[PDB]
Design an enzyme around this catalytic site. Structure first.
Site, PDB file in Angstrom:
ATOM      1  CG  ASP A  39      -2.229   0.657   1.012  1.00  0.00           C
ATOM      2  OD1 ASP A  39      -2.225   1.900   1.004  1.00  0.00           O
ATOM      3  OD2 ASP A  39      -3.276  -0.017   0.884  1.00  0.00           O
ATOM      4  CG  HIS A  69      -5.385   3.817   1.376  1.00  0.00           C
ATOM      5  ND1 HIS A  69      -4.813   2.639   0.948  1.00  0.00           N
ATOM      6  CD2 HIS A  69      -6.693   3.743   1.031  1.00  0.00           C
ATOM      7  CE1 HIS A  69      -5.738   1.871   0.400  1.00  0.00           C
ATOM      8  NE2 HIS A  69      -6.888   2.517   0.438  1.00  0.00           N
ATOM      9  CG  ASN A 161     -13.763   1.383  -3.604  1.00  0.00           C
ATOM     10  OD1 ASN A 161     -14.101   0.374  -2.991  1.00  0.00           O
ATOM     11  ND2 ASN A 161     -12.694   2.095  -3.274  1.00  0.00           N
TER      12      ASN A 161
END
Length: 279
Positions: A39, A69, A161
């Site tokens: 990430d 994040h 998403n």
């Protein structure tokens, strides 16, 4: 063990019903397992990680999380208050820049890094990787995720998403990894969650409280938030000896709460991650 006033998603993963606020789990808590968070990095100095987090690799000028994040996702895996597996070891691999973006070539290198790097770590109970990232379909990205899984790592990836079929996104569309959709505190499919036959499981993804950079906390939403619930759950179940990296996604689906989510499109699994812990 019981954590009172837990974030709703932790309570949800140990419950047969929505609407409770205590998280129940075996005190082994993922001890002896390892979870890689691939990430934007992890703020390992956050008190919530208790010295159990460390950066092991970056492709940029710093290994620090300048975004938040990655720190949030790592907190859901394994922080003391916000985490599923509160005693796991967390390893950060920074494939995303501080704006949250990364080239597929860097992401692929990061996955192959983890497949090798686990041989440099002590993870007697097993190894998990959490990938709260993705973009459009790429066979090369899917193949890298498949290699990581094949190497003996439980790979959990975000469905995406887009409120769309995850077959058009990577690594979400790779069949051999665990593709995670998002739900909300009322057991509804999250409004943004991708769907489709490639999903394996849903986890809590709307309004998820976790760690943030600057030693802080915040609540955010995404399939990025559901994925680390599943990664932490895998690490916890592997520490208990109930499953292995190769079989954990299937075991989580086997033992999930079934048929309890609303707005699941026909053809998408109606399965919500559940630890089946009996206190």
């Amino acid at each position: 063990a019981a954590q009172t006033n837990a974030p709703w998603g932790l309570a949800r993963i140990s419950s047969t019903s929505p609407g409770t606020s205590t998280y129940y789990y075996d005190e082994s808590a993922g001890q002896g397992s390892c979870v890689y968070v691939i990430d934007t990095g992890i703020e390992a100095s956050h008190p919530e990680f208790e010295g159990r987090a460390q950066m092991v690799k970056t492709y940029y000028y710093s290994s620090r999380d300048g975004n938040g994040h990655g720190t949030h996702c790592a907190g859901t895996v394994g922080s003391r208050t916000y985490g599923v597996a509160k005693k796991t070891q967390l390893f950060g691999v920074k494939v995303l820049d501080d704006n949250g973006s990364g080239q597929y070539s860097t992401i692929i290198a990061g996955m192959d890094f983890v497949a090798s790097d686990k041989n440099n770590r002590n993870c007697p109970k097993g190894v998990v990787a959490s990938l709260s990232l993705g973009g459009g379909y790429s066979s090369s990205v899917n193949s890298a995720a498949a290699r990581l899984q094949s190497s003996g790592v439980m790979v959990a990836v975000a469905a995406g998403n887009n409120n769309a079929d995850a077959r058009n996104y990577s690594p979400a569309s790779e069949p051999s990894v665990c593709t995670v959709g998002a739900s909300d505190r009322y057991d509804r499919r999250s409004s943004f969650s991708n769907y489709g036959s490639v999903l394996d499981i849903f986890g809590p993804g709307t309004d998820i409280l976790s760690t943030w950079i600057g030693g802080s906390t915040r609540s955010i939403s995404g399939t990025s938030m559901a994925t680390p619930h599943v990664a932490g759950l895998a690490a916890y179940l592997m520490t208990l000896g109930k499953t292995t990296a190769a079989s954990a996604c299937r075991y989580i689906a086997d033992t999930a709460n079934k048929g309890d989510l609303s707005n699941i499109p026909f053809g998408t699994v109606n399965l919500l991650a559940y630890n089946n812990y009996q206190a």
